[PDB]
Design a protein around this ligand. Structure first.
Ligand SMILES: Nc1ncnc2c1ncn2[C@@H]1O[C@H](COP(=O)(O)OP(=O)(O)OP(=O)(O)O)[C@@H](O)[C@H]1O
Ligand SMILES: [Mg+2]
Lengths: 38, 49, 194, 100, 116, 211, 209, 286, 150, 94
């Protein structure tokens, strides 16, 4: 579930930049938010 | 070429002294009755079906 | 449609079972030059970060793409000849290799004539690295087909461009495609009755 | 008394020869033809769907869901009445109100 | 040759006839060709020079033009040119065929309402 | 602040670069940092490269941005005036009056060349706007550029469909055309025919299979 | 006869004069909460295609919970003030009515009116009034509230991805909520509004002072 | 002016006809005059009821005429009690045309309604026009210097009905009215009626000009002024710009008809397919 | 002077200075001059702006009545040089104040916009509507004359 | 005086008939157009005024006869198509 939440957060990060394609940066920034912050 | 511009095959004119054929500038097809005529035979055929 | 679909997946390509990524970008560039307008080509292909990266390792395809955009018509014809042989040996582009090259030649002639009111035959021959007789025959074939908006004054060897309205071109397609549709409707009623 | 009541909703003779605004007539033609563009796309789906539909669903499944065929006919009827009248009235006016 | 407009070969057909019996019908044809050639010129040439049309009309003596000119009503110009300004009689797009168009549009309405 | 700089150095969309400079500005503003003027500079520059220079006046007029009203904001505000007026001459005067605030900043100086090309198109449109047929030499006089440079740009603009016209090399004139918008009724009619053809295809399968 | 969908609705939308005067700037120090509500309510309302292109499934509803006085209702006021979409404001206690069936009825009028006026935001403050996890089948109150909640679950289940309606529910007693309300597809985004931290405190102090 | 349009309801027409048929009985066949009742909505009058008043005039002298104005007040109060929202809006008379003495009668009616509207309601069933001609009194200020005089200015009149009024009218016209004709046929019939109405009005102007030409009627110089404007407004349909635009427009509408006819044929074939499938299926089971 | 800016006609700047210049700038002892057009820097700037208003008014009048005019004629009518008039006209065209297409080769300024087929037929339709209303109004006028003279 | 087909007056005709210099013709038409005496537009490039309307004036009996003669032609044209639409659309006429 935490792994799945990282993906859904990675898609959010692309949207924050108004991008269409999820980049590797988004997955890494999603990993930090899901695990370390929460 | 002389008959072709008489029969309406092409719209042009011949300069006998110079020796060339000058084609007439094309007229706006959509600004005359031809689109209506083409549509009429298509409309009446659809209404027939 | 191929250009639209390829450009969407140029940054999401994982279908390696069909083709290599370099070959995929090669096809993407090819279909883009024939199906995209000049403003659409510069945003998606010329300035495409993913395409430009691949074009570094594909000097021939990059030369073919940028020769037309940068109005280098002599090189573009040389590149178009190279592209033509590739597509003849390619099972996907083989049935359309004659059509694609002809349309690309139409694009180059139209692009050169688009910005000018009249261009001499010699200048157009000089631009494409070809003879005056070649440009005269190619234009006369394309103008007769209705694909070039120009007319040749052969006595003075001057090509004068026209600006026909979009209403005429739309009307011919409506007559054309409507007649194609009507033929199906007529044929279907024939099947219905008996 | 019957002929007198027949005058109800009888439009004036001006309205018969009155031409609808051409800017709005083209706009109405523009909009409705665009409406049939989506309806024709939906109409194709209805043909395949009704091929594989049980006869109990010929009407129940059409309840609450828009019928592309029905709206296509209404759009066709409206446009052909609108354009024929606009064309016919325009053609009549070119000779009736003639300066020569 | 007559259909494609090879009027040069039509007059050359006199020389290479297959047999002496064919002469009569050839002259009968050549009288028709003479009007047909000049018929093109009015719609083809906007002005053609006097002796320029001699070989076009296949006239031997210049005098044979003079009688044919008035028969065809060709207004000769001072510069030995015939002015053929007659294309002004265009298909007359100046006029809208309102009655014909109103006739057609009514028929569409008939094919929509009269059916019942 | 670095996120916007890298976003702008890569010539990506400037909306994201503006946003990063906007949040960098607020954080620098909250702590009362000397670098808040640099972020306020790059925010306006992002608006300039977004072809919305009018918003630059509104930004500096805000309460948070009034504290930084100085020469650096003046540099971009006049560059915005230049883009808003579609004046290339004003741009050079802007680059002269505030050369230090504009030509010496490493971030803005990189995008100055792109601004020059962007303003060259807009000024050309403004110069040729009142004309239907104008000498190329007259256009060069108004723009204060060479005949060859303006003719090359005009030919390239015609290819880019930025304005509708043709170039007469022999007379050296630009013929501008008032094109009509495409008839969307015919566009919708054509695709309706295409979609109606698919219905005929579907009715064909129904016709042959069921009879 | 068939009545217009916007007709027959005892609950009305927010008019322009009923829009609260509370701004986003009036709220101090809720950037995490402001961002999540924006990303889950107002951004999908205007960027539904960008969600679909990326692949994110927008949350149909948002549950705002936390200790009382932590900005739950006010953010709804700010959202209603700063929205271009319709706002339907309600509190769960109004759904419980004397006339049996009027509760579940007026639940579906809220969702029908929101669907007809899409884009729209449904805000249901004090959701605990109709979303308590305990039900007594021998009492008319719990029998009716069970119908109200079941209709509420049915209505949110009845919204596909095409219908652009977002639901906001606020409660300070989310422990008493029925778990069925928090299932995916009904309230997929639970935003917590905790007690302000020290950094949050100085932003709240600065904005009021 | 003060009146933009007068909507006369079918009850008034029936009442006015009944007034004429009961006064114009074996007694005589003159014009009958009553009092119009209705409401005001923005600038469109809503004539909805009327009552008859005793009235007589001399066939020879136009200044001799009687209207029972006390009868007017008594029945108005009688009608006001039933329907207070219906006030006096003018008078009517069944005369086929105006009379010289109407301007005097309107002055008598102007006391009960300052913006009184006279509606001439022709009992005879005229073929092409509406039976109602609504007039209002105006002060025509001549520029020749002739003193300002009271005249009637025409107000466009329409026959409209109330919801229950139209229910009864459709009941009385149930058999006579033919509603089977489609909209397109009705619109073309409107165009034929428009042509007939224009020809009649053009004939009236020509008849007036004939009388002026032979000296039967004096030269007006306000009609002639208007007539030059009519002939000046006559468009030139032989212009190149107009003809091209007409062709441009006609072809724009034709393609839409062609598209709609094309869709109609496809839908018609779909109906034929379903009919043949239904026919074949019915005989298979039987 | 205020009327001169109301009449739908050309006014000449040279005439204004020779007819209103002294009364507006220097004024008279009987009627003192206001500070709108004084000798100051503000007065001089407003004096230049007044000339623009006169020039702008003339172009507005030239757009109503002329369909095509020559730059040579427009410069003469504006009391401006050809370059100044073209630059002044080019300014108004840019800010969408007045429509004008300038053909600099032939020295022609075109004040008529392209005729949309909608507009051409709408004008034709509007003429018919006025015509039918006039025919209606004439018939009513005829009926009154039949009443009076019978 | 001129028919509506030929209401395009040159500057020379206005200059000659009004005894004014050709350069003063333009200002003359402005006064006529501004007051409202006539309606139209001026084509300065072609030295021509396109006249579309004149203030209606007093007509003699003879000109009124001519005006009626135009009505007779106009009446026939309206009646001609009234019978044309009736005959052609007889089946669908209500
Ligand atoms: N971040 C904030 N900035 C400013 N005021 C705040 C903030 N958070 C809460 N408030 C104050 O909260 C008050 C109202 O509380 P609000 O209704 O927003 O809370 P709630 O969580 O919905 O409450 P409850 O759970 O009791 O229903 C306002 O008067 C407002 O001043
Ligand atoms: Mg609260």
């Amino acid at each position: 579930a935490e792994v799945k939440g990282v993906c859904t957060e990675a898609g959010m990060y692309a949207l924050r930049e108004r991008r269409v394609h999820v980049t590797q940066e988004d997955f890494e920034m999603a990993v930090a938010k899901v695990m370390q912050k929460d | 070429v002389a008959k072709a511009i008489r029969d309406g095959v092409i719209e042009a004119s011949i300069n006998h002294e110079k020796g060339y054929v000058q084609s007439k500038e094309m007229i706006d097809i959509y600004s005359t009755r031809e689109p209506q005529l083409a549509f009429h035979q298509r409309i009446s055929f659809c209404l027939d079906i | 449609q191929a250009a639209e679909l390829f450009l969407d997946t140029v940054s999401t390509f994982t279908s390696y079972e069909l083709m290599d990524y370099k070959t995929f970008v090669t096809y993407t560039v090819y279909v883009s030059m024939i199906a995209l307008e000049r403003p659409d080509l510069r945003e998606k292909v010329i300035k495409g970060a993913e395409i430009l990266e691949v074009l570094h390792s594909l000097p021939a395809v990059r030369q073919y793409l940028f020769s037309l955009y940068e109005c280098r018509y002599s090189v573009f014809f040389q590149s178009l000849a190279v592209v033509e042989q590739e597509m003849k040996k390619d099972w996907l582009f083989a049935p359309h290799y004659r059509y694609y090259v002809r349309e690309m030649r139409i694009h180059a002639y139209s692009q050169l004539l688009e910005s000018y009111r009249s261009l001499t035959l010699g200048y157009m021959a000089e631009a494409f690295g070809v003879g005056v007789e070649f440009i005269d025959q190619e234009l006369s074939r394309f103008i007769a087909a209705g694909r070039l908006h120009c007319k040749i004054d052969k006595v003075n060897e001057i090509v004068e461009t026209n600006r026909p309205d979009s209403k005429n071109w739309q009307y011919q397609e409506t007559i054309k495609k409507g007649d194609l549709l009507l033929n199906r409707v007529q044929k279907l009623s024939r099947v219905i009755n008996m | 008394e019957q002929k007198m009541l027949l005058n109800l909703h009888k439009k004036s003779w001006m309205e018969g020869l009155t031409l609808q605004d051409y800017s709005e007539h083209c706009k109405h033609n523009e909009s409705v033809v665009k409406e049939m563009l989506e309806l024709a796309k939906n109409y194709n789906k209805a043909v395949e769907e009704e091929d594989k539909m049980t006869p109990e669903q010929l009407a129940i499944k059409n309840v609450g869901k828009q019928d592309p065929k029905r709206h296509l006919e209404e759009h066709v009827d409206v446009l052909m009445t609108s354009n024929i009248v606009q064309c016919l009235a325009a053609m009549l006016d070119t000779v009736v109100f003639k300066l020569i | 040759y007559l259909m494609e407009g090879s009027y040069n070969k039509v007059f050359l057909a006199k020389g290479n006839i297959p047999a002496e019996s064919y002469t009569f019908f050839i002259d009968i044809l050549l009288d028709t060709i003479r009007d047909e050639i000049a018929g093109c010129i009015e719609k083809a040439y906007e002005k053609i020079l006097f002796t320029e049309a001699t070989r076009i009309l296949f006239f031997n003596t210049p005098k044979k033009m003079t009688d044919y000119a008035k028969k065809r009503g060709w207004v000769l110009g001072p510069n030995n040119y015939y002015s053929f300004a007659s294309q002004q009689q265009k298909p007359e797009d100046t006029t809208i065929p309102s009655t014909e168009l109103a006739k057609q549009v009514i028929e569409y309405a008939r094919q929509l309402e009269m059916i019942v | 602040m670095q996120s916007g700089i890298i976003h702008a150095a890569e010539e990506k969309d400037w909306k994201t670069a503006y946003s990063y400079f906007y949040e960098a500005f607020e954080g620098y503003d909250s702590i009362d940092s000397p670098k808040a003027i640099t972020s306020l500079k790059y925010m306006l520059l992002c608006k300039i490269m977004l072809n919305t220079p009018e918003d630059v006046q509104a930004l500096v007029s805000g309460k948070l941005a009034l504290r930084y009203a100085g020469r650096q904001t003046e540099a971009l505000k006049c560059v915005a005036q230049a883009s808003k007026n579609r004046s290339l001459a004003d741009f050079e005067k802007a680059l002269t009056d505030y050369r230090a605030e504009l030509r010496d900043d490493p971030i803005i100086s990189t995008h100055l060349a792109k601004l020059y090309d962007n303003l060259l198109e807009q000024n050309l449109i403004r110069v040729i706007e009142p004309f239907s047929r104008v000498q190329i030499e007259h256009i060069s006089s108004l723009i204060k550029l060479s005949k060859a440079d303006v003719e090359r740009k005009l030919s390239q603009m015609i290819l880019d469909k930025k304005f509708h016209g043709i170039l007469d090399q022999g007379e050296g004139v630009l013929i501008i055309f008032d094109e009509p918008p495409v008839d969307k009724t015919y566009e919708a009619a054509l695709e309706t025919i295409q979609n109606m053809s698919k219905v005929v295809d579907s009715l064909y399968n129904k016709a042959k299979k069921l009879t | 006869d068939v009545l217009p969908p916007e007709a027959d609705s005892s609950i009305m939308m927010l008019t322009s004069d009923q829009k609260p005067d509370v701004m986003y700037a009036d709220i101090g120090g809720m950037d995490i909460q402001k961002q999540e509500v924006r990303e889950a309510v107002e951004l999908p309302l205007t960027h539904f295609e960008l969600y679909k292109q990326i692949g994110i499934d927008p949350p149909r509803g948002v549950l705002m919970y936390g200790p009382p006085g932590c900005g739950k209702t006010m953010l709804a006021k700010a959202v209603a003030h700063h929205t271009t979409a319709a706002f339907i404001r309600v509190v769960g206690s109004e759904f419980v009515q004397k006339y049996l069936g009027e509760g579940p009825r007026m639940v579906r009028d809220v969702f029908r009116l929101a669907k007809e006026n899409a884009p729209a935001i449904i805000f249901i403050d004090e959701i605990d009034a109709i979303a308590t996890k305990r039900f007594d089948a021998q009492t008319g109150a719990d029998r009716e509230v069970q119908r109200i909640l079941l209709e509420l679950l049915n209505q949110m289940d009845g919204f596909d991805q095409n219908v652009n309606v977002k639901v906001i529910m606020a409660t300070n007693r989310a422990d008493t909520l029925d778990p069925a309300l928090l299932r995916p597809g009904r309230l997929d985004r639970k935003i917590e509004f905790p007690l302000p931290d020290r950094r949050q405190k100085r932003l709240i102090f600065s904005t009021i002072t | 002016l003060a009146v933009q349009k007068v909507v006369v309801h079918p009850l008034v027409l029936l009442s006015v006809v009944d007034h004429f048929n009961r006064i114009g009985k074996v007694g005589n066949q003159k014009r009958v005059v009553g009092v119009l009742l209705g409401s005001w909505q923005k600038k469109v009058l809503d004539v909805s009821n009327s009552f008859a008043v005793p009235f007589d005039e001399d066939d020879k002298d136009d200044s001799v005429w009687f209207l029972d104005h006390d009868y007017l007040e008594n029945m108005y109060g009688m009608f006001k009690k039933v329907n207070a929202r219906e006030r006096i809006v003018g008078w009517y008379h069944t005369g086929p045309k105006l009379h010289k003495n109407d301007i005097a009668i309107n002055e008598l009616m102007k006391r009960y309604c300052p913006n009184s509207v006279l509606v001439i309601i022709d009992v005879k069933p005229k073929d092409l026009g509406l039976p109602t001609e609504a007039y209002i009194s105006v002060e025509e200020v001549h520029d020749d210097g002739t003193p300002t005089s009271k005249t009637f200015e025409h107000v466009t009149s329409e026959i409209g009905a109330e919801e229950a009024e139209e229910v009864g009218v459709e009941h009385l016209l149930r058999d006579i009215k033919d509603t089977t004709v489609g909209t397109l046929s009705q619109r073309i019939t409107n165009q034929v009626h428009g042509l007939k109405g224009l020809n009649s009005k053009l004939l009236d102007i020509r008849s007036y000009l004939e009388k002026v030409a032979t000296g039967k009627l004096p030269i007006n110089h306000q009609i002639i002024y208007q007539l030059q404007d009519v002939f000046n407004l006559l468009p030139d349909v032989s212009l190149q710009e107009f003809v091209k635009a007409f062709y441009l427009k006609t072809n724009d509408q034709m393609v839409v008809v062609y598209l709609a006819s094309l869709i109609r044929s496809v839908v018609a074939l779909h109906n034929l397919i379903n009919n043949k499938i239904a026919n074949r299926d019915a005989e298979k089971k039987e | 002077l205020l009327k001169l800016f109301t009449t739908m006609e050309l006014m000449r700047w040279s005439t204004l200075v020779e007819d209103y210049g002294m009364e507006l700038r220097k004024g008279s002892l009987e009627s003192p001059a206001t500070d709108v057009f004084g000798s100051t820097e503000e007065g001089e700037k407003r004096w230049k702006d007044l000339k623009n208003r006169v020039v702008e008014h003339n172009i507005r009048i030239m757009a109503k009545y002329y369909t095509r005019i020559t730059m040579k004629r427009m410069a003469q009518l504006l009391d401006l040089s050809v370059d100044e008039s073209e630059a002044f006209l080019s300014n108004l065209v840019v800010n969408k104040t007045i429509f004008a297409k300038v053909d600099r080769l032939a020295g022609i300024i075109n004040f008529q916009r392209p005729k949309d087929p909608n507009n051409l037929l709408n004008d034709w339709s509007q003429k018919l509507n006025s015509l039918m209303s006039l025919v209606n109004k004439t018939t009513h006028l005829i009926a009154k004359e039949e009443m009076i003279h019978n | 005086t001129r028919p509506a087909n030929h209401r395009q007056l040159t500057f020379e005709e206005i200059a000659k008939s009004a005894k004014i210099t050709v350069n003063e013709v333009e200002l003359l038409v402005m006064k006529a157009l501004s007051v409202g005496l006539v309606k139209g537009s001026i084509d300065e490039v072609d030295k021509r005024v396109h006249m579309t309307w004149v203030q209606p004036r007093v007509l003699d009996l003879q000109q009124i006869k001519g005006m009626k003669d135009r009505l007779e032609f106009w009446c026939t044209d309206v009646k001609s198509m009234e019978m044309l639409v009736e005959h052609q659309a007889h089946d669908i006429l209500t």
